Amino acid sequence: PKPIPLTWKTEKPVWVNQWPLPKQKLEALHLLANEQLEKGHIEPSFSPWNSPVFVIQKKSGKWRMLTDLRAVNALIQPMGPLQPGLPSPAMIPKDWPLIIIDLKDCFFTIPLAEQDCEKFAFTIPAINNKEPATRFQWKVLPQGMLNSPTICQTFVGRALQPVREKFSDCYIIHYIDDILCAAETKDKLIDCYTFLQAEVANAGLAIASDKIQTSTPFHYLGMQIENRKIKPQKIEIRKDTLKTLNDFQKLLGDINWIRPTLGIPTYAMSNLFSILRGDSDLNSKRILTPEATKEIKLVEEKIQSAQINRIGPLAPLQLLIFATAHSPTGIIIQNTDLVEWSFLPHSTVKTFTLYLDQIATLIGQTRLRITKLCGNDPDKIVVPLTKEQVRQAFINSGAWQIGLANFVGIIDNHYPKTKIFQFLKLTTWILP
Amino acid sequence: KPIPLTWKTEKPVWVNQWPLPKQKLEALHLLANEQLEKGHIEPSFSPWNSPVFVIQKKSGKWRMLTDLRAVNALIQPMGPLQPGLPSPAMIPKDWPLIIIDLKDCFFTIPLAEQDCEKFAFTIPAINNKEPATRFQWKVLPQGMLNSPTICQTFVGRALQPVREKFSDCYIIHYIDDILCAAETKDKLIDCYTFLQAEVANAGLAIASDKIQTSTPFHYLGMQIENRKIKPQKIEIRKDTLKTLNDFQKLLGDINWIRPTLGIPTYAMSNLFSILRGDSDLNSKRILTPEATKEIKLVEEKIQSAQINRIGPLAPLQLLIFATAHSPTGIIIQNTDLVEWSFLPHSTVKTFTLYLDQIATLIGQTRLRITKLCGNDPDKIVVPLTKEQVRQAFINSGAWQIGLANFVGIIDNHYPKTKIFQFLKLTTWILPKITRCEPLENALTVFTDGSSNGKAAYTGPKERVIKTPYQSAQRAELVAVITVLQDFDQPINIISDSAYVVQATRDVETALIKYSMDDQLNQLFNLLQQTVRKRNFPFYITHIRAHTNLPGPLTKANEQADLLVSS
DNA sequence: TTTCCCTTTCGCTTTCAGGT
DNA sequence: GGGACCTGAAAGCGAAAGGGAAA
Ligand SMILES: Nc1ccn([C@H]2C[C@H](O)[C@@H](COP(=O)(O)OP(=O)(O)OP(=O)(O)O)O2)c(=O)n1
Ligand SMILES: [K+]
Ligand SMILES: [K+]
Ligand SMILES: [K+]
Ligand SMILES: [K+]
Ligand SMILES: [K+]
Ligand SMILES: [K+]
Ligand SMILES: [K+]
Ligand SMILES: [Mg+2]
Ligand SMILES: [Mg+2]
Ligand SMILES: [Mg+2]
């Protein structure tokens, strides 16, 4: 099937400089490049495009090559809701048996058009620049680019296109990281399936026969809701750190500033706010009374209330990381909606004396969670790092490399300008 | 099979040949006919034409160039392959070595048949009365944007088998300049014999007249001995320093020898500062006596200073010195200097903290050491206590990124040698007067300022100032300065301005950026002197500005605000 | 609720060096 | 006036953002 070339916003080549790597990693890079050369997945390159690569040692002792494709993905031209007059998941007869393929279980080897191979280039540097670098380009899509939703959706559509047409009676669709094919007769289905299996194997989709699952629509639609459901979270302001006048003045400043937005009458937090009365020494002690505690619960209740029930189905999710004391805080958002809070499990926190490591571990864990809720990586991760500090982290931090493996979205430090999100950034929250 | 070009467009372009002076025209004719003889160029009937001309080599011979600007604009760029010069210091010390430079490199590498038509040109007649003769390139034209990638790829393939058969040989290859080094003279001979075969098999010729076998060698702008290395260029333009352009020339000269001869960023502060002003290259600039002391110090360092070829078996160490302006790094192997590592004179932030500069430098120099020798240093020496390193790992994000995955030793034992003694240090490495947390049992002062130029503090004593400033922020910084002057005792300070608070808390160890508002620079400078001259510590924090909450800090903040009205 | 007061941070232009 | 590709450094300036008053 002659591959269709990808759509690009611009034809201007982007070159992101490869950095020096230590010998062990240069040796691992050459080893893995040759492995891929033998499988015909890469070939030598002279491209003006370049994307950085790095290698991660598994505990096996083997290395895996990751590529940072942010710069290339940013140039992909997104396509519209193609085949929108195709059937929805709701509209199948419940008397029909359903076949369920999990695309995370599969392996993809999607051939590139001649003209697209040059854009997926990379360099292995030489020690001391003693020799020219070795350069290469992918002849098949690198696995990270499947995290672009457009690419993935388009590819599976083309892969299912002929099986769907021929099998008009069969209803075959791609629902959020699951390929479904369902027909009324069990044996009418097995025919449709085995055509599909053969057709997508031709396009480059390896299907795992062992992993395949079978079940009725009602079991599926119903379980799906329970599998991807938002975790309701009775989130609280952390109180153990609140000891001195200076602690309370800072926190009560931020509460009083956000109070109108939360719809709490001015007079209604007088018990809380009167704690400021007394000794003017910044380290003088202050304690929350039960009354003051109940007033803090009003602000917590309103913050809890902001959490949505269900995600919008078109829009992608984003991740905010805040550099809170002890350990970092994440929030999953869909643009201006708050979705859910993310933390490291509390037992594991003392294990990581590098705050950077904790940021990286949180991003990896929350990426997985976001993929569970929506079926895709977030399209942006917001970190308390400058672009230069992101660049140095990719270079030096193994934790960062693991945490941001196969990420093709935006990484930046531009936080929302909504008053609620500014208020959450200024305060420390925890979930008991 | 050789590397073909990718063309955007097939529409040929004709750029007229231009006149040449007799001497240059003869040289053009001399070289052009010789290439013909070698079969590197061929007679042309192409509707493409590019100009050709000559320039002087260092040989004294001439170079045939093709002005291929319009043709290059139609060729897809290839990716670069060698970002910066190899360092000779990594050639293992006391190792016999040979230096090879291939003869007319680009012209010995064939062009793909179909591209030759596009590199067509016109040679004028020795006589202005007689007609021109037209040729084309069958080999890499000097002037073609991809010639370098193609030449590197071609020679690299030729050297690859030499690398494989002699894995214990140090082989540097830059375009056509080639170094070979081995442990023993016998091992060098075996290495070289193999090389001659492989360059000849690829149709490349070693210039026999220009081979080096003997000290002292010259390679990629460096004088290389058995151990000692210095830049060839031992001279900076210091005589005529009247224009901007004159200082640009001198400072470019110095920059090129900085890394080997060890000039810290602070030692050039006065020279760099004179670059500031009118953008015109011909703008006047005065030499200051401070700038001259700087040139004397550079000139002494040119004569004394050097770097060293290293043992191939020993790892490197990184020394970071708390030098004035910005920290300075040295890559070293025990006592032998490899390279200096320096920070920019001008900054990004208004307030660049010395601890972040240490961390930036360690990160940048770790990558450089990794590029030189293939590993991190086994040891990083920092002008920090055990306690400060501990605090840095907890609190500094830059330090965390800087030392992420550093598996070696961090320590503060410098070599007891005298050689580094001349370097001018600072004691403003970490905050010692500026406190992270409020002081115990200390007076609390509250400051404010107004666009009407009024400034005040209040609390245990009161004062209003009429300040020259028309900014609330600038007025309040004068209040903060007066507070730091008039309370010769531990103090806590509460200000409503994030701006004033961040400036005051960060100035102690800061590099202050050279802004285009001198008035602000003078204020930040006075604030910095005020903090540094303190007898006692202080702590400054932000109160949100108009909360009208209860308590004593609101009360005093409101008193300060009233003291600076109308 | 967006739409401007600045100010500060980032990216880019334009000089100089240097290497084949 | 007159080529190509790389590296490093300097100052200045224009683009865009952060914050927090102003529309
Ligand atoms: N100003 C320069 C210097 C060099 N080069 C390129 C083309 C040359 O072919 C190659 C090597 O430069 P040399 O000085 O060795 O020139 P030749 O290859 O012509 O060597 P030789 O003079 O020994 O014949 O580098 C260039 O394009 N422009
Ligand atoms: K480029
Ligand atoms: K997927
Ligand atoms: K090569
Ligand atoms: K400066
Ligand atoms: K500032
Ligand atoms: K190059
Ligand atoms: K300048
Ligand atoms: Mg030569
Ligand atoms: Mg104030
Ligand atoms: Mg309005």
Side-chain angles (χ1 to χ4, degrees), chain A residues 149-164 167-178 180-188 190-193 195-209 212-220 222-230 232-313 315-373:
Chain A
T150 304
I151 288 175
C152 166
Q153 288 193 64
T154 297
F155 169 80
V156 293
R158 308 260 206 283
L160 303 173
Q161 186 59 65
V163 51
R164 295 183 193 157
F167 286 88
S168 88
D169 310 33
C170 321
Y171 294 107
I172 302 174
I173 190 61
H174 169 234
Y175 171 67
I176 319 311
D177 86 24
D178 309 293
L180 301 169
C181 174
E184 34 179 333
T185 314
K186 180 215 58 63
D187 275 297
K188 276 178 53 258
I190 290 171
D191 293 337
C192 318
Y193 165 75
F195 187 56
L196 185 143
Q197 152 100 31
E199 271 271 289
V200 307
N202 197 31
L205 214 175
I207 304 266
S209 288
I212 297 158
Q213 184 172 325
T214 82
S215 266
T216 62
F218 174 106
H219 210 298
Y220 182 70
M223 260 213 310
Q224 194 72 329
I225 295 144
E226 283 306 306
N227 287 86
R228 310 189 173 293
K229 70 175 288 147
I230 297 191
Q233 281 155 342
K234 308 311 141 214
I235 203 89
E236 307 218 320
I237 291 145
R238 186 194 203 195
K239 277 153 215 103
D240 53 55
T241 35
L242 304 198
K243 292 141 157 177
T244 72
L245 164 47
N246 210 77
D247 304 321
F248 280 111
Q249 186 82 42
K250 179 195 164 219
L251 177 48
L252 273 62
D254 293 330
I255 291 199
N256 187 59
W257 165 86
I258 177 75
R259 181 195 42 69
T261 307
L262 302 185
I264 307 180
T266 136
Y267 55 87
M269 305 199 136
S270 271
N271 299 313
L272 177 54
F273 289 162
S274 63
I275 209 184
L276 293 202
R277 270 188 287 261
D279 225 359
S280 59
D281 174 310
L282 287 202
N283 297 339
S284 68
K285 315 262 83 204
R286 300 295 216 274
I287 61 171
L288 281 168
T289 62
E291 297 83 334
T293 312
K294 291 193 267 273
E295 294 191 326
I296 292 194
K297 155 78 182 158
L298 262 165
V299 140
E300 304 168 327
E301 274 172 307
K302 292 308 173 170
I303 299 313
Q304 289 163 2
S305 87
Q307 188 172 350
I308 46 154
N309 301 261
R310 274 153 298 285
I311 80 167
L317 298 206
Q318 290 96 27
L319 174 55
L320 297 189
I321 296 296
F322 309 156
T324 45
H326 194 344
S327 154
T329 301
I331 321 180
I332 312 181
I333 75 176
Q334 156 172 90
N335 177 188
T336 54
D337 305 335
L338 198 158
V339 180
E340 151 178 320
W341 295 70
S342 187
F343 288 83
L344 297 185
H346 180 66
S347 75
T348 71
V349 170
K350 208 44 223 95
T351 301
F352 295 119
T353 257
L354 224 58
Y355 195 101
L356 172 74
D357 276 0
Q358 287 188 53
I359 302 174
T361 301
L362 183 39
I363 289 140
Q365 150 200 312
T366 315
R367 280 182 56 201
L368 187 68
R369 174 55 210 186
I370 287 197
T371 268
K372 186 66 240 174
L373 271 162

Side-chain angles (χ1 to χ4, degrees), chain B residues 138-176:
Chain B
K138 303 159 54 185
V139 295
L140 266 46
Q142 294 189 358
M144 203 257 294
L145 84 178
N146 298 352
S147 278
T149 281
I150 291 171
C151 159
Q152 274 159 295
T153 311
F154 200 92
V155 175
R157 284 157 79 227
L159 286 217
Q160 231 167 345
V162 188
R163 292 189 200 275
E164 280 113 46
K165 218 190 177 326
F166 302 98
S167 37
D168 270 287
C169 285
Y170 208 107
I171 309 200
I172 305 184
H173 156 216
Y174 194 86
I175 286 156
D176 81 321

Side-chain angles (χ1 to χ4, degrees), chain A residues 132-149:
Chain A
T134 286
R135 287 255 295 164
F136 286 108
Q137 44 183 252
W138 293 84
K139 289 211 78 47
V140 300
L141 182 74
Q143 221 175 5
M145 290 299 307
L146 289 174
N147 278 333
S148 192

Side-chain angles (χ1 to χ4, degrees), chain A residues 13 15 17 19-25 46-48 118 123 126-135 244-246 249-250 252-254 256-257 270 273-274 276-283 286 353-357 385 389-393 395-399 426, chain B residues 3 76-88 90 149 152-153 156 160 163 170-173 363-364 366-367 370-375 393-394 398 400-405 438-442 444 492 494 539 541 543-544 547-554:
Chain A
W15 177 286
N17 268 314
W19 49 93
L21 302 157
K23 208 189 196 203
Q24 186 170 2
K25 306 202 180 131
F46 286 105
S47 180
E118 70 182 12
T123 320
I127 301 158
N128 194 4
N129 304 7
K130 87 177 54 176
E131 54 160 49
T134 286
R135 287 255 295 164
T244 72
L245 164 47
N246 210 77
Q249 186 82 42
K250 179 195 164 219
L252 273 62
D254 293 330
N256 187 59
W257 165 86
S270 271
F273 289 162
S274 63
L276 293 202
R277 270 188 287 261
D279 225 359
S280 59
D281 174 310
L282 287 202
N283 297 339
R286 300 295 216 274
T353 257
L354 224 58
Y355 195 101
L356 172 74
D357 276 0
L385 269 207
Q389 295 161 346
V390 176
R391 178 183 83 76
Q392 254 275 311
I395 299 186
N396 295 344
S397 168
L426 290 157
Chain B
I3 299 153
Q76 193 208 288
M78 297 190 177
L81 280 177
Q82 202 168 21
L85 290 164
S87 164
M90 292 304 105
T149 281
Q152 274 159 295
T153 311
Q160 231 167 345
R163 292 189 200 275
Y170 208 107
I171 309 200
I172 305 184
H173 156 216
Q364 144 195 324
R366 277 177 79 189
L367 177 65
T370 302
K371 184 190 142 182
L372 290 179
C373 87
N375 284 112
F393 269 120
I394 291 161
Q400 291 172 43
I401 299 160
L403 280 91
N405 265 256
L439 291 140
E440 291 215 329
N441 252 65
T444 306
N492 292 330
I494 274 184
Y539 155 105
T541 201
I543 185 167
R544 204 169 262 270
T547 43
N548 286 312
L549 293 159
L553 313 178
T554 307

Side-chain angles (χ1 to χ4, degrees), chain B residues 396-415 417 419-420 422-515 517-556:
Chain B
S396 165
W399 177 272
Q400 291 172 43
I401 299 160
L403 280 91
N405 265 256
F406 181 52
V407 172
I409 283 159
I410 321 179
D411 195 7
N412 50 11
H413 283 139
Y414 292 81
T417 140
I419 75 184
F420 300 134
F422 73 87
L423 288 170
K424 211 171 74 181
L425 313 179
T426 185
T427 60
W428 305 104
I429 293 169
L430 306 134
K432 311 231 274 306
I433 290 161
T434 308
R435 285 288 128 69
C436 308
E437 267 101 50
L439 291 140
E440 291 215 329
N441 252 65
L443 291 205
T444 306
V445 199
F446 302 81
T447 60
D448 202 12
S450 155
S451 41
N452 64 14
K454 295 176 93 184
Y457 59 96
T458 184
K461 296 143 57 181
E462 251 195 60
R463 188 179 199 166
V464 177
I465 317 301
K466 178 62 157 317
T467 82
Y469 295 100
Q470 290 145 89
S471 186
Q473 298 183 351
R474 286 188 203 208
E476 204 185 356
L477 282 180
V478 191
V480 162
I481 294 157
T482 313
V483 176
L484 285 187
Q485 292 162 4
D486 304 359
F487 299 78
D488 190 38
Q489 64 202 282
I491 35 165
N492 292 330
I493 320 183
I494 274 184
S495 178
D496 85 339
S497 168
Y499 184 87
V500 171
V501 168
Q502 202 59 51
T504 309
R505 92 190 335 169
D506 280 1
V507 86
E508 176 176 344
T509 70
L511 200 35
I512 302 158
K513 188 197 138 249
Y514 177 76
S515 155
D517 195 355
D518 180 46
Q519 195 34 75
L520 205 48
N521 212 293
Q522 289 287 3
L523 191 58
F524 284 150
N525 196 58
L526 172 48
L527 176 71
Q528 204 187 72
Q529 286 306 119
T530 308
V531 168
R532 288 191 167 158
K533 283 172 223 141
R534 290 269 308 157
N535 298 324
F536 304 83
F538 87 81
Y539 155 105
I540 187 165
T541 201
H542 182 225
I543 185 167
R544 204 169 262 270
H546 258 294
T547 43
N548 286 312
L549 293 159
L553 313 178
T554 307
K555 182 231 73 65

